[PDB]
Subunit: 372 residues, 4 copies
């Protein structure tokens, strides 16, 4: 398999003002001696370094892209949003929204981040590669058209899909969002649309806080083309396998996508500070294998994975590597040193049974229960 | 209330070799640009800084202590363990066990950490203070007599309890361990003993990995004097409140402690990388309030809180502050900026009902009668 | 000796936006993975920690102070400067001047920094202590009345001296500034004054860049009451001993101070990134011993040392400890592990002779040559 | 011009135990909250990132290489040194010598660092490239055959030169070492040899501490084929230009090198914590321009630059970029934001005159005639 890896070093130069994890410095929050904001360059940089040291980089088709044009950005965001962002970026940064801090030059880097997503979809639709991975930072799946949130400043995936519709005329795109938080940006933009099926697996009530959303299935022309799977906090490998087999694959089977796009955050990993789930690198490998199979059956193999969250410096690189190995069909020498440990921590039989029953009920609510 | 705060700046200078969270650097684990080992000084240091800027430190009895003597340490650890640790500490550090890396000078700093625990028990038993908090790093609750594990190198609480029995002759001590991980060191040392009741609240299967332990209730003379409460991963405030009121308080009521020691890790907080629970600073405030009340009813107020885990630099300081406010009866100006957010993330009604039923069954399995707090005559 | 140590934990919570050493992030300057701005909390924090671990803290009179009032600040800075600073502080920070970046809450912390200086002078003038040390961050000696510079936001020492003149009526204050950079704020404010002798030892041309200033000796009523000693870059222990014996002590002898204030930066140390001098901890011990002796001979022992620069995390704590040991007359167990190494690096005989001749000429220019 | 850039990401993963700048943690040296050892990955990594965002990397021949073989390493180091290093590397690291701390896996990464130097010489001798830059970390110029020192564990350049003599039979190699510290490893190995001219520009007495070395000009067969230029501390751009034109170029002209290797440390930059010199990125650009010209006149353009020291995270990337622009003949968009500021800090006329006179006397002491650049026939 021919996998394109879209990456630009400048995406690792985006940096907010001083934060302790997600907490802006000031008042009772002391400036950190070392760390900084949870969305730090180093998580993404360490994925890139492990790809290089593993030699996977040599087996990929390495590519960059021009930044997103105004035309592409304006298909989803208003001009005054672009101005406000630009102005705040030139004045050293600050807070652009709710949990949406930016640094100096963040505007140009966010444009580049959106450009990589655009180019990755384009490459896979033009037949330049069988599938693709876009290491775009800052992420996109929380961003609303006129509102930055959750560390996201442009709706990278939506911007990329609208650019793909204009240039190629792809009619049916599925967005599977396994970032551990709710993909509310993507949900909102495509809520009354049937040309995009948006599916979000997420920790129930995590982010946005208190939101589950099982009953929000889309509206009018979009009714039945948005699916939320609020997994109980503490869930791990089995919960996600169960969700994939009962909800996600049946839903994709029904929808018949011509292109699958994955909002791939790795913040469901077992050591992430920003969620409470218990995935290991083989979970992400297994999920990628399942969605790639769906892409091969319906979409001519056309699958793009766009990097979103993941806030464990130590463990995100192994999770990301697992996805890219699975995308490319190349198994590197890297062994995940936390995998066997995380297997031992999984939910017991009773908790697994409890979550499994909830997913059976949910699959029944969505009218996805087999039979076939 | 008169609260002693046992602290020494040197405890913040203990530092392992390069690690990425818990992963030793080498092989496929790249060295971190900034951070380092998850048991970093900065979590504890930021607690101490917040105590200082909040004004709480001025209202406490700030105290240090001499390091633990050989005699005190030898009551639990063998001489050859002390020698091996000493030797590795003098040769720049290395791995002393399973998830037990040490740095240069770690031996002397671990002795100091144990000394603060010893002194904090001593101060509360001598009536020098009503209660105490010991900011002892490195922690202790995983350490076995001849095996360092879980970032722990001496069994701080066991060393402190044995020193307290020698000096004061206290007959019944309860150890409540609400660090999110299983307090296996304390469990093992006191497993056939009825003079120490060890209770561990912990995430089922977290650390040590795969261990739940509900059926391990102690053996022979110690049968019924060890209780494990394996809470389901993802649990938060209600799960813990429920465990406290159905298991912990009934168990303490039956045991009639003359001293309560809390192994207080803050790694059950909702943003900790090393567990999956969802506590906020008011959870820890509420737990401290309940155990302080038990100490006042049975133990003449005698309560000591010994710092164990907690690996979120940003949030541990607010959790630690909550406990110390509750210990001292002083409310500072500090407002927890994550409290309201974490409240919105809690388990839904169905998951809370599920965990609650498991605790009811567990309380029944331990033969615990749901009696309610009353004073001992 | 009874030494007061003025310190507040909140001074360590001041933090600028992202910088690589002195370079604001943006353009070609990548955000640092770890470090940050060169004026970081950790240099000062590590001095405080070493004081605690050495047990020196137990031998000092530990004290804090209220923040500087508007009245005290307004004796040197205009109200609109206070407003502008405040407003920028409330809007998350930014650039307040030339090499003068601030963070959120920096206004309140700078007020506290000025308050510690005020209180330290007050304590020594009121006879509460024999001498004092103020660990005030952010520093002050570069700040002009209407212009923040060199990481300084209020003229801490000038604010403290004017507060001391109002409350006690001290008539003659000497300011010895051995921070490695030029104390241009103090120079400017007292340039036409004979009630304050300002002496600056500094690396020739370092900061402000290109400035030597030997010929700037004060003007009108202040003529002869400002002395600049531009030491050649690369100079170390002997250069400074030579300057102290030929210029500084004679100058103090002539002036007859009732109070000596030292702007004590430790950035002349041999491993500082922001200068090129080669001092070790015994140099600072020796300089403190000399100025304390002058204070005992003229000023009834009244000496205050106010912390200014110093940007080596590793080495500043040993230099600071040396001064405080000398102030208090208490020798701790701490051994400087770099002292013997730095001794071996000192300028050779020929370079020492060259610098010594330049200081003889300079002492002659100032009309300080012995004789007696 | 065709410039090979020898680089491997694994060279950035070498990491010693906890240090505060050069000071091992322990005793009175508190562990750093953030930074670590002064020889940190980030200085080199930020050079590589700036090369990438400037667009320079796209215009270079980016290349890696296999690690140095045992055969290559054994040409300079003894087997027991390799074994001791290997063993300490496998046991989590420690101190291999005087200012020579290693981490876990440091043995394999040091082999790779030496391999890049070997390959970079090989590529330029085989005509695969006109010149080359090897970003080899950890560095080499302090390492003696049986003694690691100054953060160096193998004698990268010596290992590379001996491998080049075996494979190609090159007869005359010049090593110009403008790392700010004395290149004592290279000096010692080639001290009685006339096939290698070693020149070190260095701050008088810096590292090794107290060493100047002007009278150490080599011995017997090597007499006149080692030159030390101890520049006064505080010197900047003019001092170095003056040394290049009065000592270095005359010396190279006399020697007639068939290959020039530069031990390129950037720690003479004006903000380095580990020295006291005042270079800016144009200084390094000017030095590279002069040595490239010498290589074109004598050595058919054959020049290799091997990265050694440089400990300013903020400023080293701009200095490194300047050299690579000069090596390749490509000027990027990058503007050095510290250049104009550093120009204003330079030594005054009197101090420049003083240093210049010392270099005139030194050139006379070496018996160096001030001939000017001409082509070899
Ligand atoms: K999601
Ligand atoms: K939809
Ligand atoms: K526990
Ligand atoms: K027991
Ligand atoms: K000065
Ligand atoms: K004056
Ligand atoms: K050199
Ligand atoms: K030679
Ligand atoms: Zn997320
Ligand atoms: Zn724990
Ligand atoms: Zn300074
Ligand atoms: Zn060097």
């Amino acid at each position: 398999r021919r996998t394109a890896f879209f990456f630009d070093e400048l995406c690792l130069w985006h940096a907010a003002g001083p934060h302790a994890l997600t907490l802006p410095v000031g008042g009772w929050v002391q400036p950190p001696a070392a760390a900084g904001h949870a969305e730090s360059p180093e998580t993404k940089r360490r994925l890139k370094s492990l790809l290089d040291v593993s030699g996977l980089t040599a087996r990929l088709q390495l590519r960059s892209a021009p930044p997103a044009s105004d035309e592409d950005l304006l298909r989803v965001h208003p001009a005054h949003y672009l101005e406000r962002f630009k102005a705040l970026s030139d004045a050293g940064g600050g807070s652009l929204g709710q949990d949406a801090p930016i640094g100096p030059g963040s505007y140009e880097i966010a444009r580049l981040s959106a450009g990589l997503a655009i180019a990755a979809l384009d490459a896979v639709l033009a037949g330049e590669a069988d599938n693709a991975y876009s290491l775009s930072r800052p992420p996109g799946h929380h961003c609303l058209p006129d509102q930055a949130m959750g560390f996201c400043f442009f709706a990278n995936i939506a911007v990329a899909i609208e650019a793909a519709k204009a240039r190629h005329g792809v009619e049916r795109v599925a967005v599977l969002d396994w970032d551990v938080h709710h993909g509310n940006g993507t949900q909102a933009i495509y809520y009354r649309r049937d040309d995009v099926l948006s599916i979000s697996l997420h920790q129930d009530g995590c982010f946005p806080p208190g939101y589950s959303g099982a009953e929000d299935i889309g509206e009018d022309r979009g009714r039945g083309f948005n699916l939320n799977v609020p997994l109980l906090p503490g869930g791990g490998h089995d919960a996600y396998m169960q969700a994939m087999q009962r909800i996600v694959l049946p839903a994709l089977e029904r929808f018949r996508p011509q292109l699958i796009v994955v909002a791939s955050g790795f913040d469901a990993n077992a050591v992430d500070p920003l969620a409470r789930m218990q995935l290991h690198s083989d979970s992400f490998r297994a999920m990628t294998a399942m969605v790639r199979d769906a892409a091969e059956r319906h979409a001519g193999g056309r699958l793009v994975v766009v990097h979103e969250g993941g806030y464990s410096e130590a463990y995100v690189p192994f999770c990301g590597l697992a996805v890219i190995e699975e995308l490319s069909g190349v198994r590197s020498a890297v062994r995940d040193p936390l995998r066997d440990f995380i297997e031992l921590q999984q939910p017991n039989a009773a908790f697994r049974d409890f979550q499994r029953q909830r997913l059976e009920e949910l699959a029944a609510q969505f009218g996805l229960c087999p039979a076939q």
